[PDB]
């Protein structure tokens, strides 16, 4: 009886195994655009992905991760609200059964069809497992997906998903350039929060871009053909793998822009 996204093991249950689920800095949150304050002190954001080394794509039973070589400073995030250097380790998405839901963050209670998380860890903690134990251990870059025009830079991901249909399957996934998943603008909101899946650790500086990327109906339909189950288990489509908005509590969402 492991955590997941069903009726019996979904987000409303997680607090029983992971009591931090009801903590003071949980994610995701609703971004109230009228309440978020421009912070002129935010340094410019630096996304340096030119040397990124992708290795593998993995269905982990909750989502699929595109994993990077993080054994040196290649692909890094710096600036914005961050002190120091954060190394890209993986990206993944959350998505819906229908185009009207799927994002974890919301904007004035609007849900997007999906949300991309580019996960980075603070190099001053030496490894990812040490970084998740620290309040400034991770920086997750969150990007909304809406359905419209295809995202050309996403199609290499869409085309390998047939090869990792079920939980525990992986495939080689070299030379993928995550710059092809970015919108034009790097304007963002930022707040202190958590991982959005168990173990729900309060270790994340969230950086959520205001400009969504557009993906096609056919691209998101291929995400929804993935399976939560393992091979030779009953088929359960990998859809609605999102946690809903959590209470903001004693936090302020800061805007990088006027
Ligand atoms: N949705 S999200 O963006 O907030 C998100 C991001 C990341 C995670 C991965 C948690 N893994 C952990 S805690 N330990 C771990 C430690 C070392 C290694 I190498 C692998 C695993 C979860 C959720
Ligand atoms: Zn995520």
Curated annotation (Swiss-Prot):
GO molecular-function terms, A-Z: arylesterase activity; carbonate dehydratase activity; cyanamide hydratase activity; zinc ion binding
Modified residues (Phosphoserine): 163, 170
Main location per the UniProt record: cytoplasm
pH dependence (record): Optimum pH is 6-8.
UniProt-reported outcome of changing residue 63 to S: 2-fold decrease in enzyme efficiency, as determined by kcat/KM ratio, and efficiently inhibited by chlorzolamide
Enzyme class: lyase
Active site: 62 (proton donor/acceptor)
Resulting phenotype, residue 65 to Q: 2-fold decrease in enzyme efficiency, as determined by kcat/KM ratio, and efficiently inhibited by chlorzolamide
GO cellular component, one term: myelin sheath
Record-marked site positions (Involved in the binding of some activators, including histamine and L-histidine): 90
Reaction catalyzed: hydrogencarbonate + H(+) = CO2 + H2O; urea = cyanamide + H2O
Start and end residues of each Alpha-carbonic anhydrase domain: 1-257
SMART domains: Carb_anhydrase (SM01057)
Recorded consequence of changing residue 119 to K/R: Strongly reduced CO(2) hydrase and p-nitrophenyl acetate esterase activities
Effect recorded for residue 60 to A: Reduced activity
Cofactor binding mode and count: Zinc. Can also use cobalt(II) with lower efficiency, but not copper(II), nickel(II) and manganese(II).
Variant or mutagenesis effect after changing residue 195 to E/H/R: Strongly reduced CO(2) hydrase activity
Protein family (similarity comment): Belongs to the alpha-carbonic anhydrase family.
Subunit structure comment from the entry: Interacts with SLC4A4. Interaction with SLC4A7 regulates SLC4A7 transporter activity. Interacts with SLC26A6 isoform 4 (via C-terminus cytoplasmic domain).
Protein's name according to its UniProt entry: Carbonic anhydrase 2
Taxonomic source organism: Homo sapiens
């Amino acid at each position: 009886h492991h955590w997941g996204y069903g009726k019996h093991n979904g987000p409303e249950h997680w607090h029983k195994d992971f009591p931090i689920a009801k903590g003071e800095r949980q994610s995701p949150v609703d971004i109230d655009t009228h309440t978020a304050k421009y912070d002129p002190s935010l340094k410019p954001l630096s996304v340096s992905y030119d040397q990124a080394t992708s290795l593998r794509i993995l269905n982990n039973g909750h989502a699929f991760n595109v994993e990077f070589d993080d054994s040196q400073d290649k692909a890094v995030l710096k600036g914005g609200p961050l002190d120091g250097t954060y190394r890209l380790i993986q990206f993944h998405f959350h998505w819906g059964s229908l185009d009207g839901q799927g994002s974890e963050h919301t904007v004035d209670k609007k849900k997007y069809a999906a949300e991309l998380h580019l996960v980075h860890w603070n190099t001053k903690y030496g490894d990812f497992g040490k970084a998740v134990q620290q309040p400034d251990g991770l920086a997750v870059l969150g990007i909304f997906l809406k359905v419209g025009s295809a995202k050309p830079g996403l199609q290499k991901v869409v085309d390998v998903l047939d090869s990792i249909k079920t939980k525990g399957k992986s495939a080689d996934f070299t030379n993928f350039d995550p710059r092809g998943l970015l919108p034009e603008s790097l304007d963002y909101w930022t707040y202190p929060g958590s991982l959005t899946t168990p173990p729900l650790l309060e270790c994340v500086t969230w950086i959520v871009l205001k400009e969504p990327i557009s993906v096609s109906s056919e691209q998101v339909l291929k995400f929804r053909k993935l399976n939560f189950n393992g091979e030779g288990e009953p088929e359960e489509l990998m859809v609605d793998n999102w946690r809903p908005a959590q209470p903001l509590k004693n936090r302020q969402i800061k805007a990088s822009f006027k």
